[PDB]
Structure 1
Amino acid sequence: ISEGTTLKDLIYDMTTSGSGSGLPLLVQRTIARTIVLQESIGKGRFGEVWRGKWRGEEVAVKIFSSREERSWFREAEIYQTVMLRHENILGFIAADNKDNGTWTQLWLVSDYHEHGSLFDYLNRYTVTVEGMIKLALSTASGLAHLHMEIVGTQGKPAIAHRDLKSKNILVKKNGTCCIADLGLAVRHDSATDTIDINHRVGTKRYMAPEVLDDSINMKHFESFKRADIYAMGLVFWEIARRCSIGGIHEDYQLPYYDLVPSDPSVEEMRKVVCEQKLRPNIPNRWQSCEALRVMAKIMRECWYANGAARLTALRIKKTLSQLSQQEG
């Protein structure tokens, strides 16, 4: 990296230099070791997330606990599986490791987003009929691109998030989104039928029925995709539940807030979800706007106690991409 070089220069050189490959490790190494950390900006599942600048340009750094190294590798590994890059998927910049033994430091660097997580966004905000769609349409677009299975040269294998939720989604300045945190992600090769990975992972609350009650067929890939959809549905709930059509809107709430306690359990969920077959209360008066209803329609077609019945990211993308046309 010679003088004058900017992150902007590095990103461009990559996203236009043959293979969808990232920057050379050597370069990633340099970037990481020269990032100037600003301050911590979040914790969670595995590792604390910091805000940092490289030669001035903001950037996001996810510093891992030496103990959660597996999550570290899975992300780095998965993002470096051909052209995973995508407008609706968090942009990988570099991955690095320093020190050794008990004090090994593992870092992942990504793009920075002032607006932060969809979760922190929906909390301190009230979206419009407009945005409510950009947010969902994009989340959909992304999940669609992840589950997609571009076969061929630099095509991408099928990918299942396994931990999709509001905290793992970020929003940009123009109101779009992008999935994040592939720590649990799972690849699936079609030319050999496989899946590099393995218990009951992911955030309890957003867990789908087939997983909560343990019966999910981990041998069939689609099964995972199905679980993603169910979650994305809970996410859509969170979004619209915060839309504001004429001053009217409900306080931000996590799925199953009024049912299960704060920070649920695998047992406390198997109850409210599997058995009692309960889903986020779709506001009655939610049948005002045509689009606002299209959502609930989908939300219902995602929460089916049967994975096989639920829609698909692609489909959801289409009907949403459509609503984008007519509405607004």
Structure 2
Amino acid sequence: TIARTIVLQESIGKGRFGEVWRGKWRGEEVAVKIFSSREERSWFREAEIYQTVMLRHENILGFIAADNKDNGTWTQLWLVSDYHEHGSLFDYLNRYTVTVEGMIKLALSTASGLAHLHMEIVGTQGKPAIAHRDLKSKNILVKKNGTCCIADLGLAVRHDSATDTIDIAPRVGTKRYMAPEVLDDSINMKHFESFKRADIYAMGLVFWEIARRCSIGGIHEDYQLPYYDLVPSDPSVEEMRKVVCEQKLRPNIPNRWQSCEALRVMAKIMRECWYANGAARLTALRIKKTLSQLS
């Protein structure tokens, strides 16, 4: 009664695996991600993460269902979610500039989603702490109300806090957004907090992307991906490692950002997400608090 009743209308892009469509379910727009039979492990793992108890949150993509659909020749494996017409934060930031208010809304909601992912909720209906492992502007979506929600949870890892163990055996993710310790393979992958810290580094890069598009008095920067000035469009681990680990460079913080308090606060958050030492980085909770006070 899920897949059977949905009609696909428009192809809207690709996932890591799977094809994303705009579909209609009981007259409503939904997003459908479709995987083939040979991608069952990917589909199942993403279904599993989205079905985590107590996961739902305004800043996490709203999951509707996992399902199968047999068309008479082959079986499709479906994930169905809320639909957000703006699409990704990447798309949004390319299309638009934002106000100071708009920037803070995007950054705060992103941090709130990540803080929720990262947080263990204790109790009978307890939520394990979860780290994303591939956070970037392309997998954060922008809702009609101008807030963000986090998607693409297929690479996520979940923590059992009593044993300090992780639910799968984990260099995944997008090379451009990989933390220094991921790039140089020094990350201790038996340590769950290390994955949280790596997510924070990537969120700092996303905040830089947003801040570039904050237009004050007609003044703003063009849209760029982090490290656009230092690496090729599809960089290798080695190309990223030489920049981030060896030369110790980070995205440049424009001078015009010091002239505005909101932009100063954002720039300071970025610096404190970009430390080479993960243990020194801000937590998502702390970032949320700081942006909430700013909002």
- 1:206-229: per-residue Cα shift (whole Å, max 9, x none)? 111110110100011100000000
**Segment drifting more, 236-245 vs 44-53:** 44-53
* Alpha-carbon distance in 1 for matches of 2:180, 2:293: 30
Any idea what SS the aligned residue of 1:41 has?
Answer: strand
- Contact kept? 2:170, 2:189, Cα under 8 Å: no
* Alpha-carbon distance in 2 for matches of 1:318, 1:214: 31
- Contact kept? 1:164, 1:231, Cα under 8 Å: yes
Any idea what SS the aligned residue of 2:292 has?
Answer: helix
Q: Provide the aligned C-alpha RMSD in A.
A: 1.5
Q: Could you say which residue in structure 1 is the equivalent of 2:199?
A: 228
- 1:65-113: per-residue Cα shift (whole Å, max 9, x none)? 3333222111111111211000110000000124499944211000000
- 1:139-196: per-residue Cα shift (whole Å, max 9, x none)? 0000000000011111200100001000110111110011001100000011332201
- 1:120-148: per-residue Cα shift (whole Å, max 9, x none)? 00000001000100000000000000000
- Contact kept? 1:58, 1:112, Cα under 8 Å: yes
- Contact kept? 2:131, 2:158, Cα under 8 Å: yes
Any idea what SS the aligned residue of 2:194 has?
Answer: helix
Kindly tell me: are residues 278 and 106 of structure 1, through their superposed partners in 2, closer, same or farther at Cα, counting changes over 3 Å? same
State the TM-score, normalized to the length of structure 1.
Answer: 0.87
Shift of 1:199: 5.1
Kindly tell me: are residues 100 and 160 of structure 1, through their superposed partners in 2, closer, same or farther at Cα, counting changes over 3 Å? farther
Kindly tell me: are residues 158 and 100 of structure 1, through their superposed partners in 2, closer, same or farther at Cα, counting changes over 3 Å? farther
Shift of 1:308: 0.5
Q: Could you say which residue in structure 1 is the equivalent of 2:176?
A: 205
* Alpha-carbon distance in 1 for matches of 2:40, 2:177: 24
- Contact kept? 1:66, 1:102, Cα under 8 Å: no
Any idea what SS the aligned residue of 1:229 has?
Answer: helix
Kindly tell me: are residues 129 and 81 of structure 1, through their superposed partners in 2, closer, same or farther at Cα, counting changes over 3 Å? same
Unaligned runs of 5+ in 1: 1-29
Any idea what SS the aligned residue of 1:301 has?
Answer: helix
Matched positions, count: 295
* Alpha-carbon distance in 1 for matches of 2:256, 2:29: 43
Any idea what SS the aligned residue of 2:145 has?
Answer: coil
Kindly tell me: are residues 101 and 194 of structure 1, through their superposed partners in 2, closer, same or farther at Cα, counting changes over 3 Å? farther
Partner residue of 2:69 out of 81, 98, 102:
98
* Alpha-carbon distance in 1 for matches of 2:200, 2:242: 21
Q: Could you say which residue in structure 2 is the equivalent of 1:45?
A: 16
- Contact kept? 1:208, 1:227, Cα under 8 Å: yes
* Alpha-carbon distance in 1 for matches of 2:158, 2:7: 33
Any idea what SS the aligned residue of 1:296 has?
Answer: helix
Identity of matched residues, %:
99
* Alpha-carbon distance in 1 for matches of 2:83, 2:91: 15
Q: Could you say which residue in structure 2 is the equivalent of 1:300?
A: 271
* Alpha-carbon distance in 1 for matches of 2:74, 2:280: 47
Kindly tell me: are residues 295 and 46 of structure 1, through their superposed partners in 2, closer, same or farther at Cα, counting changes over 3 Å? same
Kindly tell me: are residues 163 and 99 of structure 1, through their superposed partners in 2, closer, same or farther at Cα, counting changes over 3 Å? same
* Alpha-carbon distance in 2 for matches of 1:104, 1:268: 40
Moved over 3 A (4+): 98-104
- Contact kept? 2:89, 2:137, Cα under 8 Å: yes
Unaligned runs of 5+ in 2: none
- 1:229-254: per-residue Cα shift (whole Å, max 9, x none)? 00000000000111100111111000
- Contact kept? 1:255, 1:280, Cα under 8 Å: yes
